[PDB]
Amino acid sequence: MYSFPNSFRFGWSQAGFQSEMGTPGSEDPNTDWYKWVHDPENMAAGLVSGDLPENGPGYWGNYKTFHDNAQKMGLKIARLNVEWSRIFPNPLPRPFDESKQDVTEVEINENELKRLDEYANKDALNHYREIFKDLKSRGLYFILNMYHWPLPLWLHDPIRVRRGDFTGPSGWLSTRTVYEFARFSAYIAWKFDDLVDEYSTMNEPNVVGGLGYVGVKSGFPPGYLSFELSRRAMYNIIQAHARAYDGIKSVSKKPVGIIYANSSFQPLTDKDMEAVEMAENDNRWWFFDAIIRGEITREKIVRDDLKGRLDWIGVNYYTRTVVKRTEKGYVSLGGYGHGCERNSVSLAGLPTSDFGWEFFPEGLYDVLTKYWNRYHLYMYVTENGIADDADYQRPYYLVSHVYQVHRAINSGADVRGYLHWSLADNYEWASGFSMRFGLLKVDYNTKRLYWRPSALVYREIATNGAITDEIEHLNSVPPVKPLRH
Amino acid sequence: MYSFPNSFRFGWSQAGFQSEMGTPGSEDPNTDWYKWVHDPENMAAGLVSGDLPENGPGYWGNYKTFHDNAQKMGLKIARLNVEWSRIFPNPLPRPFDESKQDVTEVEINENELKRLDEYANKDALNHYREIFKDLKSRGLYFILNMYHWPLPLWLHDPIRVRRGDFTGPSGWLSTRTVYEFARFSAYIAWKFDDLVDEYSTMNEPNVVGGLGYVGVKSGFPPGYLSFELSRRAMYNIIQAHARAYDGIKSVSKKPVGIIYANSSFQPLTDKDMEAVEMAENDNRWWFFDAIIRGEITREKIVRDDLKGRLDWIGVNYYTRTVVKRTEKGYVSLGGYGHGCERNSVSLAGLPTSDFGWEFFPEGLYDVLTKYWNRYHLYMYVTENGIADDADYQRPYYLVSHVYQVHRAINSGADVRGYLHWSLADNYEWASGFSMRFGLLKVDYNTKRLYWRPSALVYREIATNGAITDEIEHLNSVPPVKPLRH
Amino acid sequence: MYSFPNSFRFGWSQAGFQSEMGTPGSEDPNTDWYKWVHDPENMAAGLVSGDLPENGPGYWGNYKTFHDNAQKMGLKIARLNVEWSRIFPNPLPRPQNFDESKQDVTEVEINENELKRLDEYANKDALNHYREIFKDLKSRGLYFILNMYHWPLPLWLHDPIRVRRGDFTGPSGWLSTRTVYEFARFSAYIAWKFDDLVDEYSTMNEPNVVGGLGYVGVKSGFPPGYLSFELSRRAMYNIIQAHARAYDGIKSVSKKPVGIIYANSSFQPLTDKDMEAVEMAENDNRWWFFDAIIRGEITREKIVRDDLKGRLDWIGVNYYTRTVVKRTEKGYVSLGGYGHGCERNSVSLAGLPTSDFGWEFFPEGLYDVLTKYWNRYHLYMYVTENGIADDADYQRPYYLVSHVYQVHRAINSGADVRGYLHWSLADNYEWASGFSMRFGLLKVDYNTKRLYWRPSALVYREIATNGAITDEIEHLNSVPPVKPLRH
Amino acid sequence: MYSFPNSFRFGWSQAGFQSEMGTPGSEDPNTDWYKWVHDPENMAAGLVSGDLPENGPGYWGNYKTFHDNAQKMGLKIARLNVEWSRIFPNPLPRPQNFDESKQDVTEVEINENELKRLDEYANKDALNHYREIFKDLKSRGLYFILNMYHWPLPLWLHDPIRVRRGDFTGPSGWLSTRTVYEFARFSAYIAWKFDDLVDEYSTMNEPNVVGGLGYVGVKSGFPPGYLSFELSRRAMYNIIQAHARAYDGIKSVSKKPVGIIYANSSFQPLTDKDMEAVEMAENDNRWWFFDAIIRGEITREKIVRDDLKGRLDWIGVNYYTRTVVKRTEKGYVSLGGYGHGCERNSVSLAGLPTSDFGWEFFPEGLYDVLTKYWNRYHLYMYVTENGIADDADYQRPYYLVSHVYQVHRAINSGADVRGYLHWSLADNYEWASGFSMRFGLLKVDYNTKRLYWRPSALVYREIATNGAITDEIEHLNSVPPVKPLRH
């Protein structure tokens, strides 16, 4: 038995854009992402799969079923987001000097909130209230996230930017987006604080800037290749996080955190330990040092409006990244972590998922304890899961990672919950529906949900608050012999 | 939902030799099989794996745990055997003319039973009583089987016979074995009838004679290659079944059946339908026509002492056998059914098990309905399962086959239960421990049992008496893309 | 036995950028492609592999060794290109009588005086070196097809990074009629200098890939990687008129045959209800292009241009694999899991083995392509490329024999096909994929630049020296057994 | 370059039973092996494949074509056997001065008068046919090693079905000293008839396999398939004394070298703590046998037999793969998942590719075996077998070049090794496995009996005509890439 604290909660995470659409009446055509995945040129280039999110699992209409299943599974926590574009589909009046690099303050008061109120879509606001009330009524603790990637089209036209035209709405490249995000987040907390337990400002901002402007083969909007603009986007999103933290805190006393995409950086050989540290600096610490300690590079300074803007860390973890020392610095290696062949084995002989991500549960222990030792902020594992339609690997994946969280808590790290990605299959961004991460399988023709055996395993864990004696063998690597190489 | 009749029972089957040993005090060195798998020459030849049954899952001592788990799984029926050698480890006094081919009658009465009683091991008899009482106390309906392959060494010395020496105890080649089996079966029914719900005389007699004397590469005792002796063994085992039926019926009013190894014979092309029929004659109907209709070949006759000696049919089913028409008759084809590569795909593209057996659940519907249409005797599916340590295929295997049983009942066949092979991993004959068929995994170092996700799936089925809506997707073929080819 | 006509030639094709660099003194840093593969951002994005052409097989310096092996192998034809960038590494004077705003380039006047002026700007070391290469080539008894263009443009004509970035103020490559005008002059000029050594000419190699991958298939990491249906059309329009202008140019200085080399796929129907889909795909991918440069038919409205009509003497067929199509409401789509859209070192959805590149084994498609061209246009052809990425040499013996057989089959059916040129003699730099895709009959050790005979090279030698698939190797006219290969 | 001594010969080995039959008139129904593979019960049990040798590659009739190809391939040595059964298909007279109850056969007297008597019983058509084959062989410049025995015994000496059934009253093969006595006479007789054509002699091929698989490894489906440690020892005891008696026999009629061909495996330690295990395995599988026929050391009690001592001029090394061993309390065990105990068309537990037969790629083992023999006995050797079951020819080019290199390495270290004979020239009947295991440099189409050159055959021709691994094929001295192969 591996028993968790009585206060520890097991649950799940999901995103608005990935799960909401699919039921008639749910369509939200007003985001950069919606436009991006419908774009004829993006489709012909293979940048997007050609699958469309309006053919999705239909959480917007079927949320009661989702929650019914989650309750039956014994889950006690959920993290979801509201979609900005649903609440504000139309442009807000110009507010603020757009040529200034820093946004140190965004003034938000009761009167400003009442004015914003008149622009908000009330149908969407009432529907979300209904979803969240139904959620709370199952005994689910609620982490509300403000942002999980799609921006209102009125703030970002991604095709224009892709084409190299910067005269239009430019998303995270514009401080206008920073200003409006602060206001949006304060406004949502204002409307939903009676229902919310904890807040996150945003999900995986590092991936928004990284894949949007560098990893362009990923087919993320706006797919404009530029080191400089990637830096600018990330600078703005950092500021946006701090201003959203102040915004929410002006209307709420509840915890405000952020959810980040992590990898566990591992040395190729014993001579690469420094390369791991440089990787951790470049991918993790630079970002969190900004929003926790105010340390940022604009020249390297301390910004008082950034310092201390975080109560908790949401750890998203899937796999490792193996690095080696170079003359110039360090490189990441293909054949490990997220850079493997699909349904195969890595260069280390470890099985890979439908997405080609390597099985490496130790990485989660590494990430949790590293964060804990540097900052001593409490954590939630806000995502962990595997693309696995067949459910071959998931039972092992689930048990092993949950064990590593036990390991972290045992070593002294304050981790308060584990949220699996995800409860049901959903739209996997540029990859479409083929990457199936659900504990429950979705038949997209009927929107019916099915329990993969892993869901039965998770029920065992959640209802007992433990990896029970009977499933402890699943804390191991999926046998590779019967799997594809 | 696929709902079963209120009287239908879900459970499991296991064998004495495969599951009993493993706990100190359980050792039974007194069978042909025990001697056979310890034989130095057999081990050097690779005829046996070198694994030894005394290192087994230890049901003899740990039966309460087995039954605890079965109860938790919601199982309502069990089929087990007593091991002949445990009850009579020492030779019985010569009784009877051994040169006569036919055994038409074996006289058994109260006084003869009392005499047999004085030779029986009382420790073994009391232990079995304890096991079976514990079984009944969980609400498990009890099918007791008399014979599941091992013979007392005093009736068969398999190494002598392997060596081509026929002067010693010769097992099924001797009518003495027929005579003593009748007596044994009457005696066991006499002792245990208060605990037993239904009886089977024997398990897979076709495999005893087939692999023992023809399929010699299988490493089954006595491994003496001879068409003629294979025929003689089968003739004797048929007689033994009839005499055991009369024996039990002299002491009990309860149903007496037999459990047989079936395959579903399938045509390679649409021009091979007759080849299927010939295969069904040669592997199934010849045997059941003997014990039901008394029709046998000795010249082709009707034996009144054989006729009508069967109340029910135990169907063991794993996979198909594909056949084609020949000039001389028909042949079975490699690359399908049980003749495939391990952890691969068949020539039809269907996944194969750890044992190289092809996934083919339709065959079960074929077998059940064929038996029903010919004889109209009720059935139990007494075995169905898969060698699958990883549990990749089993959830699909289980749900799909259970669905086919529903299909059979729906078409009018009287099938009263489904017993999975098996509850836990066990000693797979010449293959040893590497072929793992359990719903529960056995750690052979500690004898601890673990729930594979399939066991959680079976619990869903058994406690609901249905394939529930939530697991219905598992009524399909395991996706082959992620599996080894 | 499958015997070829006495006049039929077996040989190979090779590209300047892919094979020249690798030996000291061979570097050519002056193309869009060179800058493209060195670009930090392209590398970080994984658009390019990070391998660099200057570490290549070194044909610039080692050409005598290549030719030695080709001669030993009994090869009798070669097709190679001159790199534009090496001849004119610096810009030429903005030209006379040229209006860059006009859509059409119907004429480019080139005379002897103009050629002599051009000659002042040409790099003489490069010119002499190419003469030395080509002379050595002819001395081995190789018939020489000289191609003018195999993808890289001089940087002064195309800055691909600027264009990737969406800045159209600089040298814009095939988006600018200046490039059309200069290509005409370049082609006439090369023909003027080398015609004593050349047997036949090709203007361009795979122009459909330049425009297609450049401006639509942007994941391929081809320059300038700017995603635009509109600009792909403009590029292709310009390349077509560039071809026609280059044909006139060469013809002004030479009597020899002038053709073009094109990237072909055999379009195959998913089901028997998709035959029309194949036709549409053949229209969209092949006939529209050749109808323009043969029949002058083009869309600008659908028109006939007299300056385009009849500008082709022969067709170079580049063939690797099929594309499977199906009918749609809107039209037709290509299917993944067949043709060039398969997993590497695996099997297609039809159970056919795939190459190191994920390309499906389908020799029948070559017979399809050759006979379809023949029946439409009745212009003679060469198979100018056919080969497989296969470092281990598992599949190549089968690949080679099977495709060579399909050419035999085409000739037998009446198609005029005069040679077969394997891609390629030796491993080389495979564009955005770098060195890992190895197409050579000969293996290259990139550390030493030593060449090695893969067993397929011994098989090709049998074919070429006999002018036949001989009885002893005829079994290779089959599909590589899939059971022992990866799935 | 890896160059071999001028006197070194490259060639091939072949067996009578595996290759002779297939052409009209070639049938030899008179062996234990023939009856064994036709047996209904053996077939139903899957002990034998159901393929029949009479449908074979047809060397009996087509030998001129085999030799033609071998000559074209530049081969300079061949090792072949005469089939006992074809020469003496009927029983010979119960002999003079012979006591069948005696364990030891220390002497078999054979004189000219005895030879002339034997000659009355010999099949003259078979004798003349073999002369014709061997004459054609020598006329291609092939040096000829004639082996006396390659497994099948005349049925009058061994009824394997009777023995399988546990009936020891009939002809019992190597279980009877009569077979020892007759083999001596047979060998002397063949040497007497053919010595003008023979260069060197081998008495037997792989006797350890005859006894090992016959009486212990019964799943292999080798006759008589009777499982008995005791009878395996008796068979091996008789085969050893048969070899010694055959050596004396041949030597009575010829001055030429007489050796033996043996089935070798390179024993390799699982971990660095298993070096002693290797030694024990080498004792149990190799040295015990050769210590008997070279040093006369045998166990009957451990004794020296003067009639056994010194009965060997040369060692024929048959080598395919390794065996990995580990230390046990009782001694040592061989491990599955390495060597000959792997999955077919896969990878071993060490990640090395396996053949169609499930045999692991391990060329280093050949260097091990050759040098170990050399250091113990200092008798010259031939590599009399080395090859791979590989119908597709994926691995064979690497297999061949790598093993040939290891022989170069052995010679360099000082071992006297005088030739390398690939198994085999053409596909043939692989015993209980039938035709599906294809070992040929040449592919056989069993329908037409036509031979085809697999690319490995072109590679071997390079080796043999140059007496070297040439620079151009040296890259094949490596492991077949595993990524594109099945795992």
Between the alpha carbon of residue D86 and those of residues A58, A167, B451, B458, D13, the distances in Å are 81, 95, 64, 65, 19
Between the alpha carbon of residue B324 and those of residues B345, B360, D46, D435, the distances in Å are 20, 18, 18, 22
Record the tokens describing residue C357, joined without a space: 């590149």
Residues belonging to chain D: 487
Within 8 A of B470 by CB-CB distance, chain A residues are 449-451
Nearest to B481 by CA among A346, A392, D485: A392
What span, in angstroms and rounded, lies between the C-alpha atoms of A223 and B17?
A: 65
Residue B141 zone, left/alpha/beta (φ > 0; ψ -120 to 50; rest)? beta
Catalytically active residues of D are 206, 385
**Which chains touch B (3+ CB pairs under 8 A)?**
A, D
What span, in angstroms and rounded, lies between the C-alpha atoms of A441 and A439?
A: 7
Strands (E), C272-431: 297-299, 302-304, 315-327, 332-334, 381-385, 417-422
Q: How many CA atoms lie within 13 A of A20 on its CB side?
A: 21
**In C338-347, which positions are buried (b, 16+ CB within 10 angstroms) versus exposed (e)?**
bbbbbbbbbb
What span, in angstroms and rounded, lies between the C-alpha atoms of B463 and B73?
A: 7
Between the alpha carbon of residue C395 and those of residues C258, C483, D455, the distances in Å are 34, 13, 11
Residue A50 in contact with partner chain C when CB distance is under 8 A? no
Interface test with D, best of C473, C475, C479, C483 (most D CBs within 10 A): C475
Range of the domain at B286: 1-485
**C-beta atoms surrounding A374 within 10 Å:** 16
Within 8 A of A457 by CB-CB distance, chain B residues are 453, 456
Residue B447 zone, left/alpha/beta (φ > 0; ψ -120 to 50; rest)? left
- The contacts of residue B130 (CB under 8 Å, 6+ apart) are none
Residue B441 in contact with partner chain A when CB distance is under 8 A? yes
Residue A345 in contact with partner chain C when CB distance is under 8 A? no
The one-letter amino acid code at B424 reads: A
Record the tokens describing residue B423, joined without a space: 């509850």
Q: How many domains does chain C have?
A: 1
Nearest to A366 by CA among A266, A275, A291: A266
Question: Degrees (nearest 5) of the Cα angle D279, D284, D288?
Answer: 105
Instruction: Note whether C485 contacts D484, CB cutoff 8 Å.
Output: yes
**In B402-431, which positions are buried (b, 16+ CB within 10 angstroms) versus exposed (e)?**
bbbbbbbbeeebebbbbbbbbbbbbbbbbb
Q: Three-state SS for C453?
A: strand
Residue A483 in contact with partner chain B when CB distance is under 8 A? yes
- Residue A252 · residue A200 · CB < 8 Å: no
Instruction: Note whether C345 contacts D483, CB cutoff 8 Å.
Output: yes
CA A426 to the chain's CA centroid: 14
- Give the phi and the psi of residue B7 in degrees, each rounded to 5: -90, -15
- Residue C197 · residue C127 · CB < 8 Å: no
Closest chain C residue to D476, measured at CA:
C454
Instruction: Note whether A453 contacts B451, CB cutoff 8 Å.
Output: no
Q: Is B274 a catalytic residue?
A: no
Task: Looking at B141-219, list the stretches that DSSP marks H as alpha helix, in order from N- to C-terminal side.
Answer: 158-162, 175-192, 205-213
Within 8 A of C354 by CB-CB distance, chain A residues are none
Residue B164 in contact with partner chain D when CB distance is under 8 A? yes
- Residue A316 · residue A262 · CB < 8 Å: yes
Contacts across the C-D interface (CB distance below 8 Å) = 75
Within 8 A of D167 by CB-CB distance, chain B residues are 164
- Residue C180 · residue C241 · CB < 8 Å: yes
Residue D206 in contact with partner chain C when CB distance is under 8 A? no
Closest chain A residue to B481, measured at CA:
A484
Record the tokens describing residue C34, joined without a space: 């060179």
Within 8 A of B390 by CB-CB distance, chain A residues are 392, 478-479, 482
Nearest to A231 by CA among A275, A303, A290, A150: A290
Residue B473 has its nearest CB partner, among A395, A441, A470, at A441
Furthest C-alpha separation in chain B: 65
Within 8 A of A165 by CB-CB distance, chain C residues are 166
Distance from CA of B253 to the nearest CA of A (A): 41
- Residue A424 · residue A57 · CB < 8 Å: yes
Instruction: Note whether A390 contacts B478, CB cutoff 8 Å.
Output: yes
What span, in angstroms and rounded, lies between the C-alpha atoms of A173 and A171?
A: 5
By DSSP bridging, strand C451-453 and strand C442-444 are antiparallel
- Residue in A54, A83, A383, A460 annotated catalytic: A383
Resolution (A): 2.0
Closest chain A residue to C213, measured at CA:
A45
For chain A, give the residues followed by a break (C–N over 2.5 Å). Answer: 95, 298
Q: Classify residue B142 by its DSSP letter.
A: E
Q: Three-state SS for B100?
A: coil
Q: Where does residue D402 rank: exposed (0-12), middle (13-18), buried (19+ CB within 10 A)?
A: buried
Q: How many CA atoms lie within 13 A of D141 on its CB side?
A: 10
* SS3 sequence of A342-361: CCCECCCCCEECCCCCECCC
Record the tokens describing residue B292, joined without a space: 């039901």
- Residue in A204, A280, A428, A460 annotated catalytic: A204
- Residue in B204, B358, B428, B460 annotated catalytic: B204
Within 8 A of C65 by CB-CB distance, chain D residues are none
**C-beta atoms surrounding C287 within 10 Å:** 19
Residue D229 in contact with partner chain B when CB distance is under 8 A? yes
Within 8 A of A46 by CB-CB distance, chain C residues are 217, 219
Instruction: Note whether B40 contacts D165, CB cutoff 8 Å.
Output: no
Contacts across the B-D interface (CB distance below 8 Å) = 53
**Which chains touch D (3+ CB pairs under 8 A)?**
B, C
Strands (E), D130-194: 143-149
Nearest to C424 by CA among C15, C4, C121: C15
Give the position of tokens 């013979």.
Answer: B151
**Which chains touch C (3+ CB pairs under 8 A)?**
A, D
Residue D234's domain is classified under what CATH number? 3.20.20.80
Nearest to B363 by CA among B341, B388, B338, B344: B338
Instruction: Note whether D452 contacts C459, CB cutoff 8 Å.
Output: no
Closest chain A residue to C221, measured at CA:
A217
- Residue D108 · residue D184 · CB < 8 Å: yes
Closest chain A residue to C214, measured at CA:
A45
Within 8 A of B484 by CB-CB distance, chain D residues are 487
Q: Is A98 a catalytic residue?
A: no
Within 8 A of D486 by CB-CB distance, chain B residues are 485
By DSSP bridging, strand C2-3 and strand C468-469 are antiparallel
Residue A450 has its nearest CB partner, among B343, B441, B472, at B472
Instruction: Note whether A485 contacts B484, CB cutoff 8 Å.
Output: yes
Tell me the β-bridge partners of A420: A12
Interface test with A, best of C227, C233, C342 (most A CBs within 10 A): C227
What span, in angstroms and rounded, lies between the C-alpha atoms of C116 and C278?
A: 49
- Residue D311 · residue D249 · CB < 8 Å: no
What span, in angstroms and rounded, lies between the C-alpha atoms of A364 and A400?
A: 10
Q: How is C227-250 classified by DSSP, letter by letter?
A: --HHHHHHHHHHHHHHHHHHHHHH
Residue B45 has its nearest CB partner, among D44, D164, D227, at D227
Residue A226 in contact with partner chain C when CB distance is under 8 A? yes
By DSSP bridging, strand C200-205 and strand C468-469 are unpaired
Residue A326 in contact with partner chain C when CB distance is under 8 A? no
Residue A456 has its nearest CB partner, among B449, B457, B481, at B457
Helix %, strand %, coil % for chain A, to 5? 40, 20, 40
Helix or strand (DSSP H, E) at D13: strand D9-13
What span, in angstroms and rounded, lies between the C-alpha atoms of D434 and B47?
A: 22
What span, in angstroms and rounded, lies between the C-alpha atoms of A366 and A117?
A: 44
Within 8 A of B226 by CB-CB distance, chain D residues are 41, 165
Give the position of tokens 């701090």.
Answer: A242
Nearest to D76 by CA among D464, D479, D487: D464
CA dihedral of residues D135, D139, D145, D149 (deg, nearest 10): -30
- Residue D144 · residue D135 · CB < 8 Å: no
Strands (E), D195-314: 200-205, 258-269, 297-299, 302-304
Residue B471 has its nearest CB partner, among A450, A460, A478, at A450
Instruction: Note whether D452 contacts C473, CB cutoff 8 Å.
Output: yes
Technique employed here was: X-ray
Residue A425 in contact with partner chain B when CB distance is under 8 A? no
Record the tokens describing residue B332, joined without a space: 């079975």
**Terminal CA-CA length for chain D:** 33
What span, in angstroms and rounded, lies between the C-alpha atoms of B227 and B367?
A: 26
What span, in angstroms and rounded, lies between the C-alpha atoms of C41 and A230?
A: 11
**Which chains touch A (3+ CB pairs under 8 A)?**
B, C
Nearest to A311 by CA among A248, A236, A251: A248
Rg (CA), chain C: 21
Asked whether the bond before A222 is cis by omega within 30 degrees of 0, the reply is yes
What span, in angstroms and rounded, lies between the C-alpha atoms of A207 and A419?
A: 19
Record the tokens describing residue D127, joined without a space: 């004798």
- The contacts of residue B188 (CB under 8 Å, 6+ apart) are B82, B87, B144, B146
Distance from CA of A453 to the nearest CA of B (A): 6
What span, in angstroms and rounded, lies between the C-alpha atoms of B229 and B217?
A: 17
Nearest to B149 by CA among B227, B211, B67: B211
- Residue A393 · residue A319 · CB < 8 Å: no
What span, in angstroms and rounded, lies between the C-alpha atoms of D404 and D366?
A: 9
What span, in angstroms and rounded, lies between the C-alpha atoms of A53 and A33?
A: 10
